[PDB]
Amino acid sequence: MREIVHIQAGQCGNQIGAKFWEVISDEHGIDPTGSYHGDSDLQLERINVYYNEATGNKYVPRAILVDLEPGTMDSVRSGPFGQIFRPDNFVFGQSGAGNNWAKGHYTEGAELVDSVLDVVRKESESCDCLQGFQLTHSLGGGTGSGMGTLLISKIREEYPDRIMNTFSVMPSPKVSDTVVEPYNATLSVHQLVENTDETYCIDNEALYDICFRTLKLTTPTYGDLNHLVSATMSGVTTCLRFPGQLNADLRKLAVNMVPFPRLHFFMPGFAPLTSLTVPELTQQMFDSKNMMAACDPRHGRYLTVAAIFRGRMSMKEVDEQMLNVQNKNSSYFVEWIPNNVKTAVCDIPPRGLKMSATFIGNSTAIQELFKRISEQFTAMFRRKAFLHWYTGEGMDEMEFTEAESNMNDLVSEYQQYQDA
Amino acid sequence: KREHEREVIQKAIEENNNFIKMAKEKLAQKMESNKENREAHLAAMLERLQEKDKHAEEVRKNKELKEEA
Ligand SMILES: Nc1nc2c(ncn2[C@@H]2O[C@H](COP(=O)(O)OP(=O)(O)O)[C@@H](O)[C@H]2O)c(=O)[nH]1
Ligand SMILES: [Ca+2]
Ligand SMILES: [Mg+2]
Numbered sequence: 001m002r003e004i005v006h007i008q009a010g011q012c013g014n015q016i017g018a019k020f021w022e023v024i025s026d027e028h029g030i031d032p033t034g035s036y037h038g039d040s041d042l043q044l045e046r047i048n049v050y051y052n053e054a055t056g057n058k059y060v061p062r063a064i065l066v067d068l069e070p071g072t073m074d075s076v077r078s079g080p081f082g083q084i085f086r087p088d089n090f091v092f093g094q095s096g097a098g099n100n101w102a103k104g105h106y107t108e109g110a111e112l113v114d115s116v117l118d119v120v121r122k123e124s125e126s127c128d129c130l131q132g133f134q135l136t137h138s139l140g141g142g143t144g145s146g147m148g149t150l151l152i153s154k155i156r157e158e159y160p161d162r163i164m165n166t167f168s169v170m171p172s173p174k175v176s177d178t179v180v181e182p183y184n185a186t187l188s189v190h191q192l193v194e195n196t197d198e199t200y201c202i203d204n205e206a207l208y209d210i211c212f213r214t215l216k217l218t219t220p221t222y223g224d225l226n227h228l229v230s231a232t233m234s235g236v237t238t239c240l241r242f243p244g245q246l247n248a249d250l251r252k253l254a255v256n257m258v259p260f261p262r263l264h265f266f267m268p269g270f271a272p273l274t275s276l277t278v279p280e281l282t283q284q285m286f287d288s289k290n291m292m293a294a295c296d297p298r299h300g301r302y303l304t305v306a307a308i309f310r311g312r313m314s315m316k317e318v319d320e321q322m323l324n325v326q327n328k329n330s331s332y333f334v335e336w337i338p339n340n341v342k343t344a345v346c347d348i349p350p351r352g353l354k355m356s357a358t359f360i361g362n363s364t365a366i367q368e369l370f371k372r373i374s375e376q377f378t379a380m381f382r383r384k385a386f387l388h389w390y391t392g393e394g395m396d397e398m399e400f401t402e403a404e405s406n407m408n409d410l411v412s413e414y415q416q417y418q419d420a
Numbered sequence: 421k422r423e424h425e426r427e428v429i430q431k432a433i434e435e436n437n438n439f440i441k442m443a444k445e446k447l448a449q450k451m452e453s454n455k456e457n458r459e460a461h462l463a464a465m466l467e468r469l470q471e472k473d474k475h476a477e478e479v480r481k482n483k484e485l486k487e488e489a
Contacts, residue, residue, distance in 0.1 A: 106428040153421060394432030 001249035004049055004125035004240065005120060006134050009066040010097070010104075010144030012169050013137035015222065018076045021061055024050065024241065025081055026351055027234065028356035032081045034058040037397065042348055045243050052126065064089045064119050065261040066151070068108050071095040075414065089123075091116045098178065101184040102393035104146020113150055120155065131250045132163030132197075136233075139188040140171030140181035140204075149419025150192035155193050163420060169231055170369060171206035172294070173376065175225070180253040180386050183400070189370065189403040190406040192265075197254045199265050200236065200360075201369060203294040214289060216275045226337045231350065232270050232292060235358025238308050238346050246344040247306055256342055257304045257362050262413060265366050267293040269359030278313055278353055282321040283355040293369050298417055300333045300365025305341040311355030315345055336420065346368055367414040377404055 008017030025031075028047055029038020029413045036044065036059060051059040063085055067073050070092050076082050077090065093112045097103040124130050133155060137144030152164060153235050168188075171181035192199050207228050239247045247253040265391035269291035272286035284309065287299055309318050322343050327334055333340055350356050380386060381400060391397070 102428075106425060107432060110429060150425075252462065302465075392432070392435075394428040394435070396431075 001131045002048060002129045003062060003129070003132050003237060003250065003335050004134055004250065005123045006050065006061065006063045006136070006147075007116075007120070008063065008136040009064060009151065010137055010141050011067070011072045011147040012141060013067055013075055013135070013144040013148065014067060014072045015169070015171070015227050016226050017063070017065070017136040017235070018079055018081070020108055020233045021063060021084065022079075022081045023230045023234045023351070025061075025084065026238070027348065028059075028241070030059050030084070032084055034060055034084050040348070042242055046241055049131075049240055050214065052123075060084065060086055064091065064116065064123065066091050066112075066143070068093040068112065068146065068147060070094065073076070089119055089332055091119055097146060098372070098389070099140075099184070100142040100389050100393065101146035101187045102390045103148045104142040104144075104148070104394045105187070105398070106146075107397065108391045109143065109147030109150050113147065113154060114150060117154055117158070120303055121158075124159070130162060132165065133159075134250075135164070135166045135185050137166065138169035138171065138175070139185040140169070141184060143189045144169075145184045149188050149195070152195045161255060163198070164196045165200075165250055166192065167195050167200045167202060167229070169229075170203045170209070170293075170373070172203060172372075175208045176323060180389065182373050182380065183386065183390070185373050186377045186403045186407055187400075188203070189410070190403045193410055194407065197258065197264055199231075201203055201265050201293045201366060202268065203369060206292045206294040209288070209290070209294070210273055213264035213271050220255060228270070228292070231356075231415065232268050232358065234350055235270055235308060235310070235356065236268055236360055238305075238310060238358065239344050241350060242346050244304050244346065245398055246342050248330065249355070253306070257306060257360070259337060259362075260417075262410060263303065263362065263417070265362075265369075267291050267295060267297070267359075267361045267363055267366055269361070271357045272353070273357075278309075278317040278321050278355075280308070280317075281355060281357045282325060285359045289292040291359065291361070293366060294372075295363070295365040297332065297365050297370040298363075299361055299368060300363045300414070301332055303337060303340065303362040303364065305333075305362070305418065306360040307341065307343045308346070308358045308360075309343065309345040309355070310347075310357070311353065312347060313345070313355050315381050316341065318345055334417065334420065353385070364414040364418040367411045367418075370406055370411050370414075374404065374407055374411065377407075 008014050009272055029036050029043045054060050065073050073090055073092055086408055095108050097108055139145045139150035156197055171185050207225040209222055211217040211224045271281050271290050326341055
């Protein structure tokens, strides 16, 4: 269980993915030219999980950049770490996806997808032992949502015994580009229920609110949102990227976090978020204001939780504080999964911080997120509003009815374990 | 799922082709009907004018027969 292949798709997917690579590159001591200039051996020990080695001690992200128009990837290529990516791993079309899941999944995306799979195959072929794949995308647009989920299906067909993990940005009317976002997200969620093992649910409303209410940013940009996402993705992948005992690979994480195959949608959180002691870190990481799915943890129960602490700190105190959280709020942890909170600690803290903590929760409260999308979907679908954009690509209404039913079923399955 | 993906795109193609075919046929029917209509309007007019020539001949003939008196 060594190599992970990363895919980033569409505008959101590429913009967040670029930031992710800048952040972990810095952490691993890799400069924009792919040269290592670090001072700790911890930096390189597991570097091969995310990077290939090239001639001259060069490290190259095992990353594939996908889009149906050139704009965002041109920007990535011009960005800070843009020259670090494999040039042959930029795979893009010209026509765009028009914020349309059907264009991403059935028409425009269908025309590009084989060339993406060719690059995926080339990367997979040079893996000693491929763990699986991580995809970054939004669910509200056309390419990341429609083409991203098409890719996931084809990857599963070709690599059915590998793990599929996604960082999936969920749309919100408060931070929205178009009105059809709920249609695109509903169509996508059904694909994710079936074809991913682990999905981190990142709600743009939560990101916005953290930026505005907590960080005191009067007018958050997508860039400000992406800074939070960056930091979170770094935190949640720490256990994959550095020496450790717990959740050290994608499958072991899945086995610890997913007690029923469809309930694999996680709420991530980060601390600190401020306009620091172990107790404070621990309280803030479990604080709903620090979580990124816009769901209230007190409205549900935790099936499983992974906590990851970073920095030099007392492991004794970490263990003490994590026990204190569970023992003092034991009702929010389902009693039929004993010892369902696992904690890891990594000595290397993220940039600019002496210590931090990252939270990954499998909570039945996540049903609130799917409920919100379901409501927004129905408000339009009851009048078949905006559907011509999809029927024009060959889809029929029955596919919308089925996706809506599938998502309502997911909501029902969470609620069942909330009352278990 | 792959079979469905193929069906969706061939459906999209079929509806676009059918839209083109229908537009092309409707326009052809309209231009033919219009041509026939305008031509018939012109023919009717010329027919009336030609009747007038007939009548004028009749008048001059009638004068000539009354001058044979
Ligand atoms: N957090 C974040 N969300 C984004 C960004 N760009 C677009 N979005 C969101 O992504 C969705 C639109 O999809 P987008 O990625 O732009 O479409 P695509 O290029 O067809 O995949 C909406 O919900 C937007 O709010 C970004 O840079 N960061
Ligand atoms: Ca085309
Ligand atoms: Mg966009």
